[PDB]
Amino acid sequence: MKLLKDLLVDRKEFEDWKNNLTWARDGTLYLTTFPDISIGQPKYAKDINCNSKNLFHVKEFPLEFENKLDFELAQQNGLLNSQPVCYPRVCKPSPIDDWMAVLSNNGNVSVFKDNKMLTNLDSKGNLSSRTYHCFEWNPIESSIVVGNEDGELQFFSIRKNSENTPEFYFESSIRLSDAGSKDWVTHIVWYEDVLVAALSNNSVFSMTVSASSHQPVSRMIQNASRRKITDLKIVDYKVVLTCPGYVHKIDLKNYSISSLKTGSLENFHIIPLNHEKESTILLMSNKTSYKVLLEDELHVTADNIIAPYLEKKFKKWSTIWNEFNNYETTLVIHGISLSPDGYSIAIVYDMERVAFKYKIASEQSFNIMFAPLYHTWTISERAVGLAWYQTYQIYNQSLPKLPENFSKLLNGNYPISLDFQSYLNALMKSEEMRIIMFLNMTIDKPSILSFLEALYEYAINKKSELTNSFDLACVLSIAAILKREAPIYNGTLLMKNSFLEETFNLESFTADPETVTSTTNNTWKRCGVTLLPILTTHVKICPVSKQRVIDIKRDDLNDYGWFTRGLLERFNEISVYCGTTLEVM
Amino acid sequence: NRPKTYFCDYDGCDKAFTRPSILTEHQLSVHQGLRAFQCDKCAKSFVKKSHLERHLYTHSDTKPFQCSYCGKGVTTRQQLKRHEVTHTKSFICPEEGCNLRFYKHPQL
Amino acid sequence: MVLTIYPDELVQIVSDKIASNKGKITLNQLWDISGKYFDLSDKKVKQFVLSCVILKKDIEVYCDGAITTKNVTDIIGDANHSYSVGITEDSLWTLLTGYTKKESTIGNSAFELLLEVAKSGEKGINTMDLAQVTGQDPRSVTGRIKKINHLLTSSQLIYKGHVVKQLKLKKFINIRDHLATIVEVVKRSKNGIRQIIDLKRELKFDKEKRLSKAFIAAIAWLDEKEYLKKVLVVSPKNPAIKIRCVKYVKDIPDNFNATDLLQNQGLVMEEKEVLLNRFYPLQNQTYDIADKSGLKGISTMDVVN
Ligand SMILES: [Zn+2]
Ligand SMILES: [Zn+2]
Ligand SMILES: [Zn+2]
Ligand SMILES: [Zn+2]
């Protein structure tokens, strides 16, 4: 299959040749461009026409920084406040929650929700202990680890998120460095229950980190050494790291060490193919790439997955910008990242002559190449919304592996009656809800009948609490579309907007999911979740199913009940049809 | 005014032109055998807007130049001038010193 | 029967109607547009609907040519002056051109031409009625219309004995066939040589960068497949002035037009297959080559290269 046409990022710059690309849970790309981040914001369109521009829209993301180490004089790190004007140096999205954390140039870590700052991470200690160099997200629970200049892996963990803005608060810190030593943390990786961290002197430590343990065993797997760790990853509990001229493989089941020469000094990026049957990695560099099979023994094999496309593009470019072979030329990779589901890769790169280059911001540009890593793929519980669609499109629209008993369609059994806000959580945590959300991205007319049965069963059970008029109106609407008996009630509903009020007989809500007629003979369309009449100039729109949702933060006239308030508070941002963020006006 | 500095390249073609669009008009018309303006009323086609405009009058009675003497219609000023010169004593005795002047050449 | 739409959808439709009718509409026209989708038989509906339109920041209200900012109910009841509604200029620009007046490449005169096509909509305008209505000559209209030919669908038609094109806003070339023509054109060129820039110019692949890319790729493919050969020709008096040309080889089964230079003897054909001294300042290095080049001097393109 052919790869989609590359996304051409223009007029953006990068300050350093490190890995600069990250790809969030909702499919949003983040590029740590200088001086401001560039976000590849996700969008929906069926006519992709082979072009990646139809999936990702690129815009500057001008966050604002405030610096806790300001006022405080730089010590053994002379560079600390050397440039007092802050800019983003590292940017990572949450793997399970939905936030972004960024390392400022002066060594603060600050956490954000979209363009709004949540909190700036701080803890008591000397100036170096307050200064951070690397950070990582817990792959299982709402918490963050930060590596400081004192060589301490410090933990912060998260609460208050249901009531108000999430509180990030200081919990504890493992001093990984030797007593009185001056080395500091540079890399942290956290896969399932195992955390692995590397200090500046190339000393590496592997430890099991869990809520159930207060005493993690900081087993140093690699002694202090001369060669710098260029990259570090966990691959089916095997740790993998690379240095100039070498790749080192370590197995954490027995703490044994092994090595292979890479044959080149160019920086190698470790790309772990987690879904393969045998633990395997692609190694990528500005001049060569190859596949290393990580069995008990190491191996060298062809990068048939990615290299053929890059070679074609490089030959194509060479045919125009180096037609005589006059110049030595290189494929500069500014970043590589796996999709959140792990089935695809994104490479950000440019082709350049080795020469007396004097570039300027307006002439700089980059290509982002999207490519499939396997012949077959599946939904993942980590990725959400447009992230599923992205993989579907990258695989040349080839459908995912559906269950053999379920290939709406499945509507899986639901023997539940949990507390209401959590009931909607458990409902969305189910595998059957995820495949329905993906199917809506493929069919000609979207539907949510399976989800409606869960709310019908809840309302039918909770009959003693359906006392509010709007709540009853919602239930009656669900019953009628579902062709199951409607609960007995009588009288007229009243609904309002900022200038107009309309009375509706509860029986005027027919089984039709499209429209409703008011007692004044005026027709109105139904809302996409509560099924109520859309009477207000404040609805959010679903970018997939084109349906409308009433913004409960904007309404200040309708006397909503517990069922209606609880429905809207749980779907005020995430689409009930497809998990995408609703657009706002 | 401006110098002819765009040269047609084809085998056996001599022409040079002032501005590159005109060289292209020549190349598509002469050497490639394509034309850009079609008659609505017959099969013919033309290389310029002004040439289709002249041809369009040929399908009509309301021809755009009209005679000052007889009132006969014509399509362009050359046709009008030649026609109107027939309504004059145009011809002159070619023999030495002879004074006479004539309206139709067989009279002379 | 009143057509069903969501409360905010009318803001799109009224914006499109306003952008069509040159940026302003009367309150009666707004009510006529609204009546297709909402029952204006009662002032309660009129108050609700006019609020939707006034609530969008891009929309402005006027009275006898002056601006108005009263409550929505006041606009329904205070029916004394002449009243009209429109959209802010930057928004009208953006809705029609896709860019703001602050940065858009279309000139004011050309934008007014676009506004005439916007007013005519599905009917569109022929270039002469456009010329007469705008009040400018066909040379001027044609020179201006180039700036907007990407926004407009067009075709030939005959009107009042003149030859003209119709213009419509959009909302109301396969290179694989041409490879044989490229080889035959180079085959028919004098001595089997043609300048690549001049070849692009003949086939009119110069109209769009899309066509340019297609042409450069085709020339490269014919070179790689050995139907043609890319060759240089060098000015006998200037080694930096070299001409990129295609040479004919076999049948199919730097941007200056140099057709001037190819008229000379020019026999320096070449079939296709850095001095920087750290220690002396750059000043002295440009001086030394400008001296060593002698009384004939040296061009900036020689010095830099
Ligand atoms: Zn010619
Ligand atoms: Zn004709
Ligand atoms: Zn006459
Ligand atoms: Zn005589």
UniProtKB/Swiss-Prot annotation, chain A:
SUPFAM superfamilies xref list: WD40 repeat-like
Transmembrane annotation, as ranges: none
Pfam families attached to this UniProt entry: zf-TFIIIC
Gene3D superfamilies named in the record: YVTN repeat-like/Quinoprotein amine dehydrogenase
Keyword Transcription regulation applies: yes
Record-annotated site: Involved in the interaction with TFC6: Y358
GO molecular function: DNA binding
UniProt-annotated location(s): Nucleus
GO cellular component entries: nucleus; transcription factor TFIIIC complex
InterPro entries assigned: TFIIIC_Znf, WD40/YVTN_repeat-like_dom_sf, WD40_repeat_dom_sf
Region (Sufficient for SPT15-binding): 399-585
Misc. comment: Present with 2070 molecules/cell in log phase SD medium.
Name the UniProt record assigns to this protein: Transcription factor tau 60 kDa subunit
UniProt organism field: Saccharomyces cerevisiae (strain ATCC 204508 / S288c)
Swiss-Prot record, chain B:
Zinc finger (C2H2-type) boundaries: 6-31, 37-59, 65-87, 91-108
Compartment(s) where it occurs, according to its Swiss-Prot or TrEMBL record: Nucleus
Position of the signal peptide: none
Additional comment: Present with 1380 molecules/cell in log phase SD medium.
Chain's role: Interacts with the internal control region (ICR) of approximately 50 bases within the 5S RNA genes, is required for correct transcription of these genes by RNA polymerase III. Also binds the transcribed 5S RNA's.
Descriptive protein name: Transcription factor IIIA
Native source organism of the sequence: Saccharomyces cerevisiae (strain ATCC 204508 / S288c)
UniProtKB/Swiss-Prot annotation, chain C:
Location of this chain's protein in the cell: Nucleus; Mitochondrion
Annotated function: TFIIIC mediates tRNA and 5S RNA gene activation by binding to intragenic promoter elements. Upstream of the transcription start site, TFIIIC assembles the initiation complex TFIIIB-TFIIIC-tDNA, which is sufficient for RNA polymerase III recruitment and function. Part of the tauB domain of TFIIIC that binds boxB DNA promoter sites of tRNA and similar genes. TFC3 is essential for cell viability. Cooperates with TFC6 in DNA binding.
Other comments on record: Present with 125 molecules/cell in log phase SD medium.
Effect of G297E: In TSV115; thermosensitive. Level of TFIIIC and its affinity for tDNA reduced. tDNA binding activity very sensitive to mild heat treatments, and TFIIIC-DNA interaction inhibited at moderate salt concentrations
Domain of life of the source: Eukaryota
Gene from which this protein is expressed: TFC3
Protein name, per record: Transcription factor tau 138 kDa subunit
Subunit description: Component of the TFIIIC complex composed of TFC1, TFC3, TFC4, TFC6, TFC7 and TFC8. The subunits are organized in two globular domains, tauA and tauB, connected by a proteolysis-sensitive and flexible linker. Interacts with TFC1, TFC4 and TFC6.
